[PDB]
UniProtKB/Swiss-Prot annotation:
This is Mycothiol acetyltransferase. The gene is mshD. It comes from Mycobacterium tuberculosis (strain ATCC 25618 / H37Rv). Keywords: Acyltransferase, Repeat, Transferase. Acetyl-CoA 1 binds at residues 73-75, 81-86. It comes from the Bacteria. 1D-myo-inositol 2-(L-cysteinylamino)-2-deoxy-alpha-D-glucopyranoside binds at residues 32, 172, 217, 227, 272. Catalyzes the transfer of acetyl from acetyl-CoA to desacetylmycothiol (Cys-GlcN-Ins) to form mycothiol.
Amino acid sequence: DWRSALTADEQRSVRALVTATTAVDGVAPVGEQVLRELGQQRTEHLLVAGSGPIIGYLNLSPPRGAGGAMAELVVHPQSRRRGIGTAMARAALAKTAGRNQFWAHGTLDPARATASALGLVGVRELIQMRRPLRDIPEPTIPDGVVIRTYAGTSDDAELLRVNNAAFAGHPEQGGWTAVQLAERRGEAWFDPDGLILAFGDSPRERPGRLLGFHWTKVHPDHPGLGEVYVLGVDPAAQRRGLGQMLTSIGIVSLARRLKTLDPAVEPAVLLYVESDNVAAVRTYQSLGFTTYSVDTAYALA
Ligand SMILES: CC(=O)SCCNC(=O)CCNC(=O)[C@H](O)C(C)(C)COP(=O)(O)OP(=O)(O)OC[C@H]1O[C@@H](n2cnc3c(N)ncnc32)[C@H](O)[C@@H]1OP(=O)(O)O
Ligand SMILES: N[C@@H](CS)C(=O)N[C@H]1[C@@H](O[C@@H]2[C@H](O)[C@H](O)[C@@H](O)[C@H](O)[C@H]2O)O[C@H](CO)[C@@H](O)[C@@H]1O
């Protein structure tokens, strides 16, 4: 039975399934956007009850922007190999007439095996890379560039202009409106001091225009973990060293934010990047990031 919205109680039950599974598998089974979708009316949901907590959950997001339908799903660790995962995946495939993809975060063995049993193949590879926060860079800020941080909604127009130009065609990051910014500003981890903006200054043709930005994020449920959450440079100002510079500034910012009674943890910064985004992979390789895990999107061949 598909539901177009979930009650507060249903949301609490799905969240418990997701967090419990994250602890057992070592990787969250559904992404952050699915957790935001639990309380909105934009997607469709399947809930599978035991004989009785919720033991299976699938979210199906419809096409939006340049992207197609996408499903994420999870089955309680103690209810696996009972056919629930197959049942939910077949339902989504039948509902979209075989057109949706499925994310397997961390591309764990059970998901690889389920994908083969269903006849699916990997069609998209999202790599998670990490770099320790030791030996931080000294960033070089070129003349004609001034850096500052997010001041509030007066900065949204420029941020959206640069985001949509840099991510034109990106299935999830492109074609944003003020609503996408607002839903992330309401997240517990949002910190205006961690959204770094690079503006053109007098020397350049367009003083005051945003050239690029680096939105950093500190993970709340993982001590010592930061993220290059969104990094983007206006196409008009690309290939001039600004991406490398912005990434370095954000690493410095995170290093500063991440005593005797603090647990010993070697802090690290992670990022996600499409395997075929050549420009970005080169920028990150240059700065010492290395592969950590892979998220694979599966679909009909
Ligand atoms: C294509 C995808 O599954 S993308 C979904 C990604 N989600 C995740 O990876 C989240 C964490 N994992 C889970 O929630 C679950 O392990 C799932 C959803 C991947 C599979 O859920 P389950 O309900 O256990 O799947 P299901 O019982 O239908 O298994 C179907 C077949 O896949 C294979 N399979 C599933 N898990 C495994 C495993 N751990 N080892 C080997 N084969 C497996 C088997 O052939 C199985 O049939 P069988 O039990 O008769 O041998
Ligand atoms: N870096 C951008 C542009 S390359 C990107 O690729 N980000 C990716 C990444 O976002 C992740 C967030 O960054 C991370 O904070 C959160 O914890 C995860 O659950 C995902 O929401 O994974 C998503 C798929 O799961 C994808 O839709 C998105 O574009």
